[PDB]
């Protein structure tokens, strides 16, 4: 029995293991929706207004995941300002702040979750009122500074109540440079939905050609009326890949008002000169769907979910939740012995 002090590592391993099992048991039950497209100037923007208008859910917890981001923005902003004070040789209006400045470097490692004693708040209020700090803020175009720096520091009263709920505009302000992804953790009909709006296309084919597999649904955005043959080639390559034989393609033909006007004035033949149908929505949409689905050639079933949509009043949540439920049911029956 070579257990000597060692019969302690196993116990640790079993506690870590239990933790890994518990997060894992909960996860994987999430319904994940992947949005792709953006092959145009503004597709995901159209997606964003439809999301704003027809999608919601702001529990306390989703607002809470932005707490660390708010704090990090604030701390990094004040750090940037202080460092610029050192760089530009700006002195305190009152030499007693030199003591604050020593504390400042200490309180700068105090950047933990939600340390907002009245003393720190007063130090920040005093710095923000300083003329050299105001001078830096008004010269912020020469360095990097959140545009909302003054907005928040001037709003500390509103910001510090424990019932603060970030607005939608607050979220829009959360700064995104090169990568995004959109997340929500709302509850609805006892299902936890997770919806992801991704862009970055026109070049990231390799990320979906094989990085995705097992996802619940694809949402493919197409610019109806906004080179083109290369797009058909990319879709052919992705669409017909043997590893994606069993994955559903769901199509939201968006900007339908402009498309309906364009097909009145712009023939479908610009894209497909061999098209002999009429320039009605139904025939042109059916023809496009046919051209895409014909690229498969290796699948007896289709289960394509086609939708007929209207204006800003369209009951979207009913439509989205019915489609989620039918796909989950058919995907639960497919592997329960019944067929």
């Amino acid at each position: 029995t070579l257990s000597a002090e060692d019969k302690a590592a196993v116990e640790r391993s079993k506690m870590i293991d239990r933790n890994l099992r518990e997060d894992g048991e909960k996860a994987a039950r999430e319904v994940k929706l992947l949005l792709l497209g953006a092959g145009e100037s503004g597709k995901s923007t159209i997606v964003k207004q439809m999301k704003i208008i027809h999608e919601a859910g702001y529990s306390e917890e989703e607002c809470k995941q932005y707490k660390a981001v708010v704090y990090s923005n604030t701390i990094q902003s004040i750090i940037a300002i202080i460092r610029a004070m050192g760089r530009l040789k700006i002195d305190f209006g009152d030499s007693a702040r030199a003591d604050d400045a020593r504390q400042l470097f200490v309180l700068a490692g105090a950047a933990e979750e939600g340390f907002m004693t009245a003393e720190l708040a007063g130090v920040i209020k005093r710095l923000w009122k300083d003329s050299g700090v105001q001078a830096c803020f008004n010269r912020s175009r020469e360095y990097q500074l959140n545009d909302s720096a003054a907005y928040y520091l001037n709003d500390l009263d509103r910001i510090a109540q424990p019932n603060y709920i970030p607005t939608q505009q607050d979220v829009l302000r959360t700064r995104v440079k090169t990568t995004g992804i959109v997340e929500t953790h709302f509850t609805f009909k006892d299902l936890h939905f997770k919806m992801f709006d991704v862009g970055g296309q026109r070049s990231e084919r390799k990320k979906w050609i094989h990085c995705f597999e097992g996802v619940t649904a694809i949402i493919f955005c197409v610019a109806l009326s906004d080179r083109m043959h290369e797009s058909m080639k990319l879709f052919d390559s992705i669409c017909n890949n043997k590893w994606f034989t069993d994955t559903s393609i769901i199509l939201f033909l968006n900007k339908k008002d402009l498309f309906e006007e364009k097909i009145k004035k712009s023939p479908l033949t610009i894209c497909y000169p061999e098209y002999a149908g009429s320039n009605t929505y139904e025939e042109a949409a059916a023809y496009i769907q046919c051209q895409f689905e014909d690229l498969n050639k290796r699948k007896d079933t289709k289960e394509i979910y086609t939708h007929f949509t209207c204006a800003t009043d369209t009951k979207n949540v009913q439509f989205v939740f019915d489609a989620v439920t039918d796909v989950i049911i058919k995907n639960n029956l497919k592997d329960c012995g019944l067929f």
Partner: antibody
Amino acid sequence: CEVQLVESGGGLVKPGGSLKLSCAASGFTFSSYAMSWVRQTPEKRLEWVATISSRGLYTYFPDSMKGRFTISRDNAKNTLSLQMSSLRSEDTAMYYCLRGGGYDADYWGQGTTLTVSS
Amino acid sequence: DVVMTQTPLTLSVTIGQPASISCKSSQSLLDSDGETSLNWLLQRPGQSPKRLIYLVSKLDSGVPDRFTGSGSGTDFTLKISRVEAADLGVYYCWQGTHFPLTFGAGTKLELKR
């Protein structure tokens, strides 16, 4: 108002004498910008004079000349002044006052001439 | 000796040929923040000295792109792709890293008659 840089005080001074140069800067944030003085000898050799911070709490002077030149600044006229005593032959030079410090001296003043001869 | 050397001291250059002048500082010019206090300056006879290059790579406003500063530590290089009439004067590399500030020897560029 208007960004103006006026230098004054230059001329001829006898050995061992004293003279007060003054540079007035207006039209910009004098209080939040540093200031510099630079001398150019007639032998095309540039020699540094002084550099003072935006608020004047930190001043850098050469040690070989400390005790001879005195620098001061007034916010009432936004003007820097420098008094020189016990001048030397090499102090016969063209003096420029510059907005900002060594890390932000982008604009050069007009300057004035100082000549020393017995 | 305290050497703040710009090399070569005197060069005859053909009209249009690029010029490269090296700047060597007696002490390292890196501060604690990792930055470089370097200015490339031109002083013309009868006119106020004009800054040519700031922060080695940030070109000053209104300065032609022909002036390019490069280098690190005590090894600096100022490059002019095309020598023109406005380039006349004395060239200086000026450091603000160490106080008191030190001025370079300079390169005297003038047009041959």
